[PDB]
């Protein structure tokens, strides 16, 4: 009873404080700084999806082992997503983002000097574990600096760095190791997978470097009884915004803010308490206050991730199959298609950013899901390479909007003391759905074109049937 009242007072006051701070230089700087972190995740996703299996096929491996790396690394991503989402609530957004990025960068760096297959697999799996927490923590961290008046518009532009990271990974793959053989012989003569591995780590390293300049979120401090730190961070935000706008004379007027109140021996108690608190936060997502919302968000996330990841990983393979069939009558194609998809997303990002705060998140999600279901089905009508590429561009442009709406809903549907936990759980479910979709769809490449498309269409139809039942978060203070 009492705690809900106090947290409602804090939520009401936080939006007023943010309106006093306003939007400007600080938010955009933080936007770029976290865009680097999302770029790291996009790079890892591309590497796992496309580089590793191609390498395995180009590797001295038994037929039974031609697809293990992607599966195991995605499972590691799932585990890391849940782990880092759970901890971010208790340790902080910036702290957990730094730790996860550090793990990712370190184990990426190690993977360059491995010599076997098990060791490279191990290093890359731990790297996947590290990066898995980037998306939940980034989306929870940035949204806490945004006022309700334009939170949806500003959150819709984060996904571009994911696309740019994927394009970067594809371009580096083409430039350094274009459909070369893979061995663990090359002597790291630039044109070796080791250098590509090292190059792909740069976005994460730069994200770590830049991230150490930004301030921890004030909402986390206020939710945990740290008044003075939150006040200083909010004053920093206000001063930066006003000094950049040409009004340095202004004074931050907020007086007081509502707040909510041997080594092997100490570490044991600390770890047990952290685990208990994280598990308690997780179970709260299934209580009577949130059980329905969580159960429907699970379905929406699962279906959307299934369809999207399955189609994206299946499309290059079926293009290669079409080319092979025509010939019977490589690495550049993936990069070109990635660049085209990144261009196609941009109109969708513009439209979603414009309409998110006007038509609401629910209508964006539902309409975009219906359009994605229809456009994905149109893939069955394409016959030539160009037609397939154009239809996929249409699918991506109409689908990216639903992802922005889903991200905004996931941010706004859960309270600030459990936001990262719920987002991490749903992102782990998304990674599991990606595993299942990539495993199922790719098996049909040499058999039939219709089955993957129909499965994706049915999954998107089911997902769009659930999106209509979620509540609308438009025009409400950040929980
Ligand atoms: C932007 O590229 C990435 C960014 C981050 C992770 C992976 C990838 N790329 C892929 O998965 C390959 C795939 C073919 C790209 C693509 C997707 C969509 C919806 C539409 C088009 C036209 C292309
Ligand atoms: C940050 C981008 C990310 C997301 N919305 O969580 N995306 C884009 C489509 C596939 C995916 O996971």
UniProtKB/Swiss-Prot annotation:
DNA damage listed as a keyword: no
Keywords, ordered alphabetically: Cell projection, Cytoplasmic vesicle, Disease variant, Epilepsy, Glycoprotein, Membrane, Neurotransmitter transport, Phosphoprotein, Synapse, Transmembrane, Transmembrane helix, Transport
MF annotations from Gene Ontology: protein kinase binding; transmembrane transporter activity
Tree of life domain: Eukaryota
GO BP of this protein: intracellular calcium ion homeostasis; synaptic vesicle priming
Residue positions where Phosphoserine is found in the record: 253
Protein topology in the membrane: Multi-pass membrane protein
PTM per Swiss-Prot/TrEMBL: Phosphorylation by CK1 of the N-terminal cytoplasmic domain regulates interaction with SYT1.
Phosphotyrosine found at: 327
Transmembrane segments: 32-52, 68-88, 96-116, 125-145, 157-177, 195-215, 295-315, 336-356, 364-384, 389-409, 423-445, 450-468
One of the record's GO cellular component terms: neuromuscular junction
UniProt subcellular location: Presynapse; Cytoplasmic vesicle, Secretory vesicle, Synaptic vesicle membrane
Extra information: Identified as the brain binding-site for the antiepileptic drug levetiracetam/lev.
Subunit structure: Interacts with SYT1/synaptotagmin-1 in a calcium-dependent manner. Binds the adapter protein complex AP-2. (Microbial infection) Interacts with C.botulinum neurotoxin type A2 (BoNT/A, botA). Interaction is improved by glycosylation of SV2.
Record disease entry: Developmental and epileptic encephalopathy 113: A form of epileptic encephalopathy, a heterogeneous group of early-onset epilepsies characterized by refractory seizures, neurodevelopmental impairment, and poor prognosis. Development is normal prior to seizure onset, after which cognitive and motor delays become apparent. DEE113 is an autosomal recessive form characterized by severe early-onset recurrent epilepsy.
Name of the molecule in the record: Synaptic vesicle glycoprotein 2A
Natural source organism: Homo sapiens (Human)
Source taxonomy: Eukaryota, Metazoa, Chordata, Craniata, Vertebrata
């Amino acid at each position: 009873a009492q705690r809900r009242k106090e947290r409602e007072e804090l939520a009401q006051q936080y939006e007023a404080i943010l309106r006093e701070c306003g939007h400007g230089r600080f938010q955009w700087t933080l936007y770029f700084v976290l865009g680097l972190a999302l770029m790291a995740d996009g790079v890892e996703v591309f590497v796992v999806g496309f580089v590793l299996p191609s390498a395995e096929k180009d590797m001295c491996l038994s037929d039974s082992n031609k697809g293990m790396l992607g599966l195991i690394v995605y499972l590691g991503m799932m585990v890391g997503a849940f782990l880092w989402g759970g901890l971010a609530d208790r340790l902080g957004r910036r702290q957990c983002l730094l730790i996860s990025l550090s793990v990712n960068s370190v184990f990426a760096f190690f993977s360059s000097f491995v010599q076997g297959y098990g060791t490279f697999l191990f290093c890359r799996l731990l790297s996947g574990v590290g990066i898995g927490g980037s998306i939940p923590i980034v989306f929870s961290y940035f949204s806490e600096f945004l006022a309700q008046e334009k939170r949806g518009e500003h959150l819709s532009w984060l996904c571009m760095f994911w696309m740019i990271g994927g394009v970067y990974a594809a371009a580096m793959a083409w430039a350094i190791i274009p459909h070369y053989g893979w061995s663990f012989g090359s002597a790291y003569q630039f044109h070796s997978w080791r250098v590509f591995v090292l190059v792909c780590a740069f976005p994460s390293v730069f994200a770590i470097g830049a991230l150490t300049t930004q301030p921890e979120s004030p909402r986390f401090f206020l939710e945990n009884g740290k008044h003075d730190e939150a006040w200083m961070v909010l004053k920093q935000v206000h001063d930066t915004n006003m000094r950049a706008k040409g009004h340095p004379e202004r004074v931050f007027s907020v007086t007081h803010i509502k707040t909510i109140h041997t080594w092997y021996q100490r570490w044991g108690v600390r770890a047990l308490s952290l685990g208990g608190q994280v598990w308690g936060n997780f179970l709260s997502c299934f209580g009577p206050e949130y059980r329905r919302i969580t159960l429907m968000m699970m379905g929406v996330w699962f279906t959307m991730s299934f369809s999207y990841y399955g189609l994206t990983v299946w499309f290059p393979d079926m293009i290669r199959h079409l080319q092979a069939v025509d010939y019977a009558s490589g690495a550049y194609m993936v990069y070109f298609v990635s660049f085209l998809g990144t261009l196609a997303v941009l109109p969708g990002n513009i439209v979603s950013a414009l309409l998110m705060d006007k038509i609401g998140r629910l209508r964006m999600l539902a309409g975009s899901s219906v359009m994605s279901c229809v456009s994905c089905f149109f893939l069955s009508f394409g016959n030539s390479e160009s037609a397939m590429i154009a239809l996929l561009c249409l699918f991506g442009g109409v689908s990216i909007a639903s992802w922005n709406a889903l991200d905004v809903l996931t941010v706004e549907l859960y309270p600030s003391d459990k936001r990262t936990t719920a987002f991490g759980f749903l992102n782990a479910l998304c990674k599991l759905a990606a595993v299942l979709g990539i495993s199922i769809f790719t098996s049909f490449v040499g058999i039939t074109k219709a089955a993957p498309i129909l499965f994706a269409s049915a999954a998107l139809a089911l997902g769009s049937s659930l999106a209509l039942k979620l509540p609308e978060t438009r025009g409400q203070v950040l929980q």
